[PDB]
Amino acid sequence: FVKVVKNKAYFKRYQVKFRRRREGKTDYYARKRLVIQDKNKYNTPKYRMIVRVTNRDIICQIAYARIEGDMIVCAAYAHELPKYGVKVGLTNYAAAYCTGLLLARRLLNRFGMDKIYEGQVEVTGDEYNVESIDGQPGAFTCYLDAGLARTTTGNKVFGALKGAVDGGLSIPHSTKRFPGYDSESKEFNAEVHRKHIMGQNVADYMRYLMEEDEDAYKKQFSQYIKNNVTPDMMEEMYKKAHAAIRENPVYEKKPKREVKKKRWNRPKMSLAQKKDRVAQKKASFLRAQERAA
């Protein structure tokens, strides 16, 4: 036999980690580097544009760090695009670009910077960045909080970056992780970036398979088929989506129905009951042992 590791001593000496290190979600090292201000700033906020891509969504938030717990100035989600006529592809690069456009215009709408700071309207895909205006209220700036994503070539965060930047935010960035950087040659095809942004990558995959074999097409693209989505319609769909967003991005909340009020969960068991169980078990055991003998 061998020594049991997990004794009392072990648990006494055992340090606990933070809640968000146990759940595996938050990296505190990077949080530290990202978030504090220089002391000579004195209470001047350091904004950060968080981006959290889920299984079936892409959330983009803005946050600044107070001691009580990081305050959100404004927040968007993907599932509002059915209102603006986008039924599917909510975790594609295009819907990332869309979400960045919302975040930008909703924020600028609150701060009263609507006629000023339009940005890139024509989606060429080359480099655009917001020059500050002389004699006017300066540009918004915030630093990117990728979080845990491996900052690899072709990521929906940097898609959302290109979108939100064109919406007009002063985020510093290179174009190196945008799709286009040939690893050998090191040049950037922005038009190919356009292609991914407009969604030809999906159309071309669905044609290649429809040509190849119809059955995979039917297994893969069910809701696409149901909703009568086609290669030709997709581009103008996303383009109208841009125009609708630019015009009226703001969110109106839903009316709360009076709640039914029922407890699905089981409440915690009181003292007297806990005291009773072992009494019944011992008495019942003694009389049952009489049954055995």
């Binding site: 072992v278 078990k281 011992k282 055991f285 042992q289």
Partner: protein, 134 residues
């Protein structure tokens, strides 16, 4: 040992010395250097003692009380100082008094376990208590 062997026979007691000597004592030897750099080599061990600390203990029956006494009184002459010979209230080498002991063992609070004895509390899981009474 010698006295108890002569008196109460080969199997009527258990002596237990309770003082392990850890302190090391030094010695300063003089072999012409003199007194300079004089820090000693090890001569040997010895055990430090506070007031009220037990040196020896002898367990046997209460019948052979005075003979135990006479052994310890003869043993005083090897040690220095002064020491008192006190008969213990404890049942053997335990921390539990003799009057309430048999009641406690009958109701199975304490359980013999060779020379030692295990105190059962109520804090464990109950299926152990079931195994005990079964």
């Amino acid at each position: 040992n010698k006295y108890m062997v002569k008196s109460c026979g080969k199997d009527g007691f258990h002596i237990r010395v309770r003082l392990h000597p850890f302190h090391v004592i030094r010695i300063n030897k003089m072999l012409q250097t003199g007194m300079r750099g004089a820090f000693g080599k090890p001569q040997g061990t010895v055990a430090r003692v506070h007031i009220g600390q037990v040196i020896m203990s002898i367990r046997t029956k209460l019948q052979n009380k005075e003979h135990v006494v006479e052994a310890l009184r003869r043993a005083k002459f090897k040690f220095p100082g002064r020491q008192k010979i006190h008969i213990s209230k404890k049942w053997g080498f335990t921390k539990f008094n003799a009057d309430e002991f048999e009641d406690m063992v009958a109701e199975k609070r304490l359980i013999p376990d060779g020379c030692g004895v295990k105190y059962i509390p109520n804090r464990g899981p109950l299926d152990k208590w079931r195994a005990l009474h079964s």
